Write a protein that binds this ligand. Sequence first.
Ligand SMILES: *[C@@H]1O[C@H](CO)[C@@H](O[C@@H]2O[C@H](CO)[C@@H](O[C@@H]3O[C@H](CO)[C@@H](O)[C@H](O)[C@@H]3O)[C@H](O)[C@H]2NC(C)=O)[C@H](O)[C@H]1NC(C)=O
Ligand SMILES: *[C@@H]1O[C@H](CO)[C@@H](O[C@@H]2O[C@H](CO)[C@@H](O[C@@H]3O[C@H](CO)[C@@H](O)[C@H](O)[C@@H]3O)[C@H](O)[C@H]2NC(C)=O)[C@H](O)[C@H]1NC(C)=O
Ligand SMILES: *[C@@H]1O[C@H](CO)[C@@H](O[C@@H]2O[C@H](CO)[C@@H](O[C@@H]3O[C@H](CO)[C@@H](O)[C@H](O)[C@@H]3O)[C@H](O)[C@H]2NC(C)=O)[C@H](O)[C@H]1NC(C)=O
Ligand SMILES: *[C@@H]1O[C@H](CO)[C@@H](O[C@@H]2O[C@H](CO)[C@@H](O)[C@H](O)[C@H]2NC(C)=O)[C@H](O)[C@H]1NC(C)=O
Ligand SMILES: *[C@@H]1O[C@H](CO)[C@@H](O[C@@H]2O[C@H](CO)[C@@H](O)[C@H](O)[C@H]2NC(C)=O)[C@H](O)[C@H]1NC(C)=O
Ligand SMILES: *[C@@H]1O[C@H](CO)[C@@H](O[C@@H]2O[C@H](CO)[C@@H](O)[C@H](O)[C@H]2NC(C)=O)[C@H](O)[C@H]1NC(C)=O
Lengths: 177, 177, 177, 324, 324, 324
Amino acid sequence: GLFGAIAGFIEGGWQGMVDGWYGYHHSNEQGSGYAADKESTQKAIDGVTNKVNSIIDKMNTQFEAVGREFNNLERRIENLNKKMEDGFLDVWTYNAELLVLMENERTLDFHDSNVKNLYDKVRLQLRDNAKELGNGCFEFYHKCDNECMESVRNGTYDYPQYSEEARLKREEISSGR
Amino acid sequence: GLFGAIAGFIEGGWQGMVDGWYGYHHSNEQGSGYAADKESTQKAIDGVTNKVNSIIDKMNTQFEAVGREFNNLERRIENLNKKMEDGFLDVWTYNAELLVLMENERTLDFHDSNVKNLYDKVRLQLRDNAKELGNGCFEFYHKCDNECMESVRNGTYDYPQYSEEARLKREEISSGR
Amino acid sequence: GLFGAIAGFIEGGWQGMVDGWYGYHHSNEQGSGYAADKESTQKAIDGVTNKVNSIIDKMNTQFEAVGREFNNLERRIENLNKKMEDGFLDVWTYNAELLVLMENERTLDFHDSNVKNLYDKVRLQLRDNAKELGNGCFEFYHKCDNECMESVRNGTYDYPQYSEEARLKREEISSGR
Amino acid sequence: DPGDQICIGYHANNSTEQVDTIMEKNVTVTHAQDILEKKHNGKLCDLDGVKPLILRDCSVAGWLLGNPMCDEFINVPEWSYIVEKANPVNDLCYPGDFNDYEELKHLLSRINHFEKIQIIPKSSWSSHEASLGVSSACPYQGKSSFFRNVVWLIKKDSTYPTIKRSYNNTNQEDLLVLWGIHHPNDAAEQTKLYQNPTTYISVGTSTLNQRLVPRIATRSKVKGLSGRMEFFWTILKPNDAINFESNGNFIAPEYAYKIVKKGDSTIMKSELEYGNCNTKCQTPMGAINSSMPFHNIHPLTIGECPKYVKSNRLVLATGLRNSP
Amino acid sequence: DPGDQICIGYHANNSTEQVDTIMEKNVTVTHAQDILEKKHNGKLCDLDGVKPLILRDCSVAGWLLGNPMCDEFINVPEWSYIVEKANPVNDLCYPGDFNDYEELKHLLSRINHFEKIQIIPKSSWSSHEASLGVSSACPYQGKSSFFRNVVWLIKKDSTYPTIKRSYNNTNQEDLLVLWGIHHPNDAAEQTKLYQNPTTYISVGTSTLNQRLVPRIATRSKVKGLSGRMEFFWTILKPNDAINFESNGNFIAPEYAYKIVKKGDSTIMKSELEYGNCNTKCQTPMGAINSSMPFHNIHPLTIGECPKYVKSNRLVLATGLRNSP
Amino acid sequence: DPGDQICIGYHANNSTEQVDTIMEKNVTVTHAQDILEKKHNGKLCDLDGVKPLILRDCSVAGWLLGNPMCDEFINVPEWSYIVEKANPVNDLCYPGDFNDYEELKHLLSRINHFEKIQIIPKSSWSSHEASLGVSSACPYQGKSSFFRNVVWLIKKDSTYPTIKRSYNNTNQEDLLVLWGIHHPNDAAEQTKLYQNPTTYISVGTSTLNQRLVPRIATRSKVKGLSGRMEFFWTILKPNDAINFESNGNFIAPEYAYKIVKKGDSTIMKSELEYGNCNTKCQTPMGAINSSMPFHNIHPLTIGECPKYVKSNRLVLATGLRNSP
Ligand SMILES: *[C@@H]1O[C@H](CO)[C@@H](O[C@@H]2O[C@H](CO)[C@@H](O[C@@H]3O[C@H](CO)[C@@H](O)[C@H](O)[C@@H]3O)[C@H](O)[C@H]2NC(C)=O)[C@H](O)[C@H]1NC(C)=O
Ligand SMILES: *[C@@H]1O[C@H](CO)[C@@H](O[C@@H]2O[C@H](CO)[C@@H](O[C@@H]3O[C@H](CO)[C@@H](O)[C@H](O)[C@@H]3O)[C@H](O)[C@H]2NC(C)=O)[C@H](O)[C@H]1NC(C)=O
Ligand SMILES: *[C@@H]1O[C@H](CO)[C@@H](O[C@@H]2O[C@H](CO)[C@@H](O[C@@H]3O[C@H](CO)[C@@H](O)[C@H](O)[C@@H]3O)[C@H](O)[C@H]2NC(C)=O)[C@H](O)[C@H]1NC(C)=O
Ligand SMILES: *[C@@H]1O[C@H](CO)[C@@H](O[C@@H]2O[C@H](CO)[C@@H](O)[C@H](O)[C@H]2NC(C)=O)[C@H](O)[C@H]1NC(C)=O
Ligand SMILES: *[C@@H]1O[C@H](CO)[C@@H](O[C@@H]2O[C@H](CO)[C@@H](O)[C@H](O)[C@H]2NC(C)=O)[C@H](O)[C@H]1NC(C)=O
Ligand SMILES: *[C@@H]1O[C@H](CO)[C@@H](O[C@@H]2O[C@H](CO)[C@@H](O)[C@H](O)[C@H]2NC(C)=O)[C@H](O)[C@H]1NC(C)=O
């Protein structure tokens, strides 16, 4: 996809997040698990349901074929008649197919732009208190329990609070020992 | 938005930047103020004016209904005539509404993609001479007055010149005093 | 473009990279040269070729004008006939012109989204084993020959293998000689 | 040693739905939504409440004039839409022409009910022979007969005195009225049937001004006959009167039609017969019962229906891309 | 202590303009652009310079043929477009028909001006009665009268001698000519009025070859009358001649029309009357004065106009999204 | 000191192809693809194998009826499509009228070949004068002549006894048959040419029932003549018989046409003449030889063609944005 997240730096999706489209996998001393991002999954549901209704709704009025019968010396407008009704049947078929196709692309790059936007939400919260691994995961320079994992999830995460324990643990790895 | 800048990592827009769409708010030793980015505001005016004229111009020629009148035994082609002019009126209604709908979304991600792209104009100019806060702001590791802030604006910002003072203040904060 | 790469952080493209759309320009002790990325160049070709065919294919059937003749006192329905066949010629002219215009934009920002995304495949492989120069280039913290450069190209790049020599070279430049 | 970790990822599952895109075909995704209805039930149904008028081997013309072979339709109930086959067998049994017939079929598309009424009593033809007017072109059951709603008058004794008959539509609805002229083969035939050699049929309304004359000619045999019948029609406005005067070759009316419920209807060309069901959507191919916004069964549908398109596939992508 | 800082941001203001998008409705943005004009002035105007021809309670048939009640229109100025009500009262005062009338109206849509000319002087009728041709269906003001541009000839003394009359178009422009035939109620009326019992009307052009005959029939009374008038019309080419011959039942012309300026025009159906204003765009419901590319007033417009669409709203997004 | 480097970049070259986008015009790119075919060869060609039927200064009417000047077309080869000029010179040489001529032209667009056949031999006219039917309007080369496929009969000695003639289509294909009526200038002329003053033409089929009567009037001279010819036509179904009876003013047939190969065809309006080439795609402006999906030559094309659009330019962008 256009934003390089889906089938990109996060290669593969998680079979186990059965309660959302986008989300988290926390991992501390207490254990690990799946937690779905509550708000962005809803933000995508609304954009897609609004889109689906807008496509059906746009084809609200559309050409309606009518039966007309013409006699033997009315051959000309008989034909005029036909090329016309067909004429219109074609225009609206082109419009339906080409619209679905176009908004299929835009549906996918919405999901893609969203994953890449949740990853950069976390990235600018933590900064150097964690190490960016490159596979879409973050490894902390400090100790983070389950109510701390929650502070990153709902956006509460406090940087100055853990920043001292992180910068002293960064200093330990600079030395090598 | 698709690029995560507008209503994203920069939460809120500035009531006080009244002379451009995108811009800066510096804050150094001498004080602070607003200064708008010169090319991207113009890069956007051109993109919007071209689109507005492109939509108006595409619809410049479009079906025009004409009055035709038929008698008591021309019931069929009377009806043929009606459904035809109606048919076309509907196609062009649809072609119009749907073009705006579509280019409105795309209008917004031009504005969004422009903000996020200007933030990375500065991020790859300063690099490690300043600290990325995550709220869309940079805090310098060196001293930067008013003709130095100007060099970041127009792209003149000199890295090797300040990299000495910054790498020494990075050393001061690594120890923790 | 929307993703800020082409005519963005890589100001200018390489006149000399003839065997592809996107690629690399390496520089070690053994020398320098051009190497085109084979999989991203090939995936973009498939995406453009499918688009060119979808466009020609959608205009598969579209209105075909027919000759009809009417006499001196069939003036009325004669006009019905002109305005119909003109009408349809207009619908399809608009549809062709506007589809190209729209899909021209999405073609350029596909190339733009791809360049920036290949730059992030490399940046997330090196991390702190290399310094981001900001001009779209990387300057290594270790010694990397041709069998090492190739491992970044095809995605093989080994971080822990070079990370020791790198963290000692980061520490030496921290000192300032 | 592993330091604590947090990861960002997206949904995946066991879905094999495929969509298409401007650049990629058959992309498998997490969730999809089809909007095209492709299935119908192959039958002709009632429409909500209403059973369609299904002419079997009859035509609209055969019905209205009353072809003997059409008796199944002598007094129909109210309908929802008429179904006529593409090439009906029992049309004008005695060969000729039904004037402005397509335009009439057009009127029928907005009519839901008739009421046959007598406007000139067959017994009333006291000084002519109503009862000889019968042809082998027009056979009941090997019995040769005639159209039922019209009457082929013939000379009585030796003479055919001038007919003057009129009927004043005193109902509050419109009256569809039909009549016709008979064109013989030669002078000999003319004088045998009607005695008077030079003849006419005049017909007046507040809007009609018609004077018909027989057209003697030598013609190919059609159904063994060389003569022809030509039928005509009008809407007789409420409180208006129609007056017939004739002199020979007159096919007079007896029964007429009061247009007595108007509304949506169509004439549906279809080979099918009555399917004993019910829909809210009918097609000349079979009925549809669906919530889909789109179908591709047949462009000419009646009732509350999805919009016709010509595609064999319209599927939306709603969910997200499924793992490579 | 704050170390030096720099931030990047975007514009905001006090604007509550809302646009729409395929995925999101009523999105409030910094700047908007409406492209649909929705207001007009409920009045019928001049079009640039020119005042429209407004037939009031007149029809096009009534004007040209010369209804007594239509005298206001005896010599119209050059117009910009004609306006006719949906069912005008002053049509054919004496009941009958205007032949090929819809097509004639068609020509009018490209004609901006006539110039009435006399082509057969009423005084020239020396051996017939020009002045008995008068009817109670055709009332001037209680004085019973007739159409003005034609003349209903009647027998003089006891007889109606054969008419042979002609006019050669020596003008450089085309000539619209009108005439007609009268259909009596019975042989008696025919012979009272024209003496001759069997009659005809022949009409020749370089292209016309017409021979009409009165069509006696017993009919409904319309406006108290049972007889009918049927009117006909032709274009007489420059330097071509028209020739009438008749024998009874002739409605002769006196005046013709030269098509003298052609151009853009329409016959516009509207109930309205003259609004004493002026525009560059007119609608049967009012004039539009606008810079917008689009309007939603009424699809049948004349003049320099925005393009009709059916929308309630067409608004573009130009600025960026405004803060929550 | 330079530490080792790796850089990411993209293609550029010296292409000056420019494309457009909704927001930006004349954008220079790396690779482009034109999809609009804009050039044709200005000529009228054969279509795959077949040479079009090109009437030069003829009309379809003049051909099928046999205008002497149209003799170039007495026996045509099979065609792919007919080309007719906008205003052919040799139409109906003796002035008059062609019934339903436009509908007949409509049939021709699906006919690729006729076979002229004799259906009533000019020599068979034993008791009338076949050979006097000749006019100064109908010049062979200064020799005044007539249409070739019909025959203008005349009284012989002093009389014109009643014609009764018939032809039975014993072929398997359909038969286009033509005939006509002669409208003289006065009673004097009528009796000079045909003796009988009261005359008629009857024509009977399994489906025709026509009795035409000459229509006397005094008319403009057209090409020195005031009289008129009015022509008529039918399709005679296989195994059907047509019978003419007349009495005067009859323009009889000699040759009829069997419809012998049907298929795609058009009547192409064009001024052009035969261009001696060949294509798979023909336009009244010239032939097209192209692979493009789109052309902008002319909307009326016949044969294997790209789809018409009205664009001046249609170009896709395929490569990437090119360096300043
Ligand atoms: C067919 O029968 C209808 C229905 O009865 C007849 O309509 C009626 O005609 C009489 C004339 O004999 C009208 O009487 C008139 O009444 C009005 C006011 O009521 C007045 O203006 C007149 O002076 C006259 O006395 C009567 O209105 C009318 N009925 C209706 C419902 O309009 C008619 O006579 C018959 N039609 C024909 C063509 O014979
Ligand atoms: C109606 O009257 C007009 C009067 O303008 C007549 O038109 C004229 O017709 C005469 C023939 O009688 C033409 O005279 C001729 O001159 C031409 C050369 O111009 C020559 O070829 C002939 O030998 C003849 O002498 C004359 O051209 C024409 N006038 C104009 C202005 O074109 C005509 O007689 C009447 N039209 C009809 C249809 O009766
Ligand atoms: C024009 O000529 C055609 C072709 O010769 C004629 O058609 C033939 O008509 C005869 C009757 O005269 C038919 O013979 C009959 O056969 C039927 C069944 O086929 C049988 O039921 C009868 O006893 C009768 O003897 C013959 O079938 C028919 N030929 C074809 C090929 O159909 C006909 O006489 C002429 N058509 C017209 C309209 O004048
Ligand atoms: C889309 O998936 C189907 C998988 O079968 C293919 O579509 C077509 O369907 C038949 C059988 O249903 C396949 O055998 C053919 O490949 C297709 N038919 C034709 C006439 O082309 C197809 O393989 C897939 N499309 C793409 C572009 O991969
Ligand atoms: C979009 O905003 C409008 C403005 O209120 C809403 O449309 C309707 O507006 C009328 C008054 O114009 C109100 O009475 C209603 O609130 C609306 N009617 C209906 C039937 O909804 C509309 O609610 C807004 N749309 C969305 C999706 O928020
Ligand atoms: C688009 O590019 C072409 C490049 O020339 C321009 O198109 C026009 O054609 C002539 C010569 O081909 C140019 O010199 C003119 O500038 C153009 N004519 C007109 C009437 O504008 C044009 O410059 C470019 N389009 C725009 C809008 O600048």
